[PDB]
Structure 1
Amino acid sequence: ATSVNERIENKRRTALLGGGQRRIDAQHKRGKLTARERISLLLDPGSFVESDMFVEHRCADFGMAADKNKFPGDSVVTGRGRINGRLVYVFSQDFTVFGGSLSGAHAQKICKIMDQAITVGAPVIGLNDSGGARIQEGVESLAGYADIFLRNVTASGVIPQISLIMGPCAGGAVYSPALTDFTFMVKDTSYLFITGPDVVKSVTNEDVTQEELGGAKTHTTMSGVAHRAFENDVDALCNLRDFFNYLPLSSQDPAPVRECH
């Protein structure tokens, strides 16, 4: 008798529920969904293939060795799928697991997805909502960001890259969306800034809050970082589908041609 089969079910039901039901309820109260249903609405039904769902971080500092800080998947869902019959690779961050803060396994999964996409020649779509780099790793988070930036720069001009900011992205995670072709926003829930308002309090001593600091209005009206803004998440994802229906899979292919009337 081996428990190597009930372990699979326990790990899967933990991964499908993220970091707990309380965090899911808190996310829903804020008007935000979770990663897996964004993936489901973004892709065609019955076409999503997940990868690296059993990858775990390796930290052994500041008490993460306990099981209470042990989460399968490591705050990211990565896979491949089809939109209107055309291949694409997708990754999303889970805000329930340490606020989506990136670690070694997170960066490794993103890097494997990007490597597969550049090898086969398929576009990349990223749904970003993460709090930055997790401190207790140290330099490995910086190495992960550097690797993501390197692969973003290498694939530039070869395959298209798209990003949706669906939540507060702060710290060094704001540079991957800036290195892609297009950047989109979701109003009233998405933010983008280098540092929080507390540092502004400390150094500049002037009154400002988060909304005009890094809100969608600021970046779509007087900053020039984002391209468009959307009312909510479902409309944003439908518009992303429609937009992706416009552009080709690679620079080696001609511009798409559709049926006309």
Structure 2
Amino acid sequence: IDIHTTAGKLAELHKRREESLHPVGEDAVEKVHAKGKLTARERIYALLDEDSFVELDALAKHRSTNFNLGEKRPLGDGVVTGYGTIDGRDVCIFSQDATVFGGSLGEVYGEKIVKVQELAIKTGRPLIGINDGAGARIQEGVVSLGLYSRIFRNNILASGVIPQISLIMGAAAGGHVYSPALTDFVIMVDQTSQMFITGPDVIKTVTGEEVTMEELGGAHTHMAKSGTAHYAASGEQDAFDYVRELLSYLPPNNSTDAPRYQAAAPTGPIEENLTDEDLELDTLIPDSPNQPYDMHEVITRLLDDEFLEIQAGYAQNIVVGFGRIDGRPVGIVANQPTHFAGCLDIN
């Protein structure tokens, strides 16, 4: 074990690569599993294809000396970044470890995220971010705010260029929540995840309103009240199935075509290629001018079956979402007569 020989050095590296798997001891990983939740990395391993993850800055450590912070310096800083592939397509991803400083962002922690953001924009690949953690790390100072800006800045720079998906499986309080809003799609876990600027405590001691974290910013309130959540996953795994499904419709970037499936080669005319499912639409509209009907009946009959609805629990008077018509991905936008007669409203 001579730390001076090449062999000793390689051995030293494997020790750190090892500790990084549990930066704050294995006992911490136990509590996480004891709550049915997954680890920051286990989530990446779950979402990305098997054995496709390539971690970056896995051994980085914070460099602060304020308020006895130089006492505890975990590997990773409390964040797991890197890249892999979701269904064969390269993607850049990062997951926050709430067990490490409550998932609060520090300088190195920020640098690690900024690195992934620049990688995704540079390679023109999607950027997936799993959020879970308290506000900025106060001990480090304003450096955290500075890095925050750096992160937001890249989000608005990548907006509409690179698909950006945000997965909320934790709490996530503070300016931390502004990053997800800037992205394209925000996926939440109904219950196991919240989102809010100010915590119930402060809200309590400033307004008097007494509310719980769930009430204040759970998946259901951001899905039917704020209109910020695009999907409320029933469980962590479901949250992932949604994210892969979403990416299946989108291209790697704005300069690329949305992926298409094999398109059938019919013979026409349409009047001879009409199927039973098609004809069912000739009698779907009620003989009465006001009698409502589920617009989903029309949607499901038009495309190859299997509609990925967006914000299904928000403004149900309008239905939007992804699907495929003849192997071609299309965006559906329909009014739902079964709600407000299909009228349009602010939401």
TM range (shorter): over 0.9
The answer to whether the Cα contact below 8 Å between 1:89 and 1:113 also exists between their aligned partners in 2 is yes
Larger radius of gyration: 2
Q: Which moved more, 1:184-193 or 1:46-55?
A: 46-55
Matched, 1:188 2:194: no
Matched, 1:155 2:154: no
Shift of 1:260: 4.1
* Whole-angstrom CA distance in 1 between matches of 2:94 and 2:12: 25
Q: How does 1:106-255 map to 2 (within 5 A)?
A: 106-255=109-258
SS at 1:170 equivalent? coil
Shift of 1:62: 0.9
Deviations 1:44-89 (A, max 9, x none): 11211111112111101111222xx120111111111112211110
- Map of 1:35 onto structure 2: 40
The one-letter code matched in structure 1 to 2:121 is I
The one-letter code matched in structure 2 to 1:50 is E
- Please, what TM-score do these two structures have when normalized by structure 2? 0.72
**Structure 2 gap segments, 5+ residues each:** 265-347
Work out which of the residue numbers 40, 43, 63 in structure 2 matches 1:58.
Answer: 63
* Whole-angstrom CA distance in 1 between matches of 2:94 and 2:234: 22
* Whole-angstrom CA distance in 1 between matches of 2:120 and 2:237: 26
Cα-Cα RMSD:
1.3
Q: Which moved more, 1:186-195 or 1:10-19?
A: 10-19
- Map of 2:270 onto structure 1: none
Shift of 1:193: 0.8
The answer to whether the Cα contact below 8 Å between 1:55 and 1:74 also exists between their aligned partners in 2 is yes
* Whole-angstrom CA distance in 1 between matches of 2:136 and 2:91: 27
The answer to whether the Cα contact below 8 Å between 1:51 and 1:78 also exists between their aligned partners in 2 is yes
- Map of 1:21 onto structure 2: 26
Aligned length in residues: 259
* Whole-angstrom CA distance in 2 between matches of 1:109 and 1:207: 37
- Map of 1:48 onto structure 2: 53
Instruction: Judging by fraction of residues, say which structure has more helix.
Output: 1
- Map of 2:94 onto structure 1: 91
- Please, what TM-score do these two structures have when normalized by structure 1? 0.95
* Whole-angstrom CA distance in 2 between matches of 1:187 and 1:78: 25
Deviations 1:75-122 (A, max 9, x none): 111111112211110111111111111111111111111111111211
The answer to whether the Cα contact below 8 Å between 1:48 and 1:82 also exists between their aligned partners in 2 is yes
SS at 2:249 equivalent? coil
The answer to whether the Cα contact below 8 Å between 1:18 and 1:94 also exists between their aligned partners in 2 is no
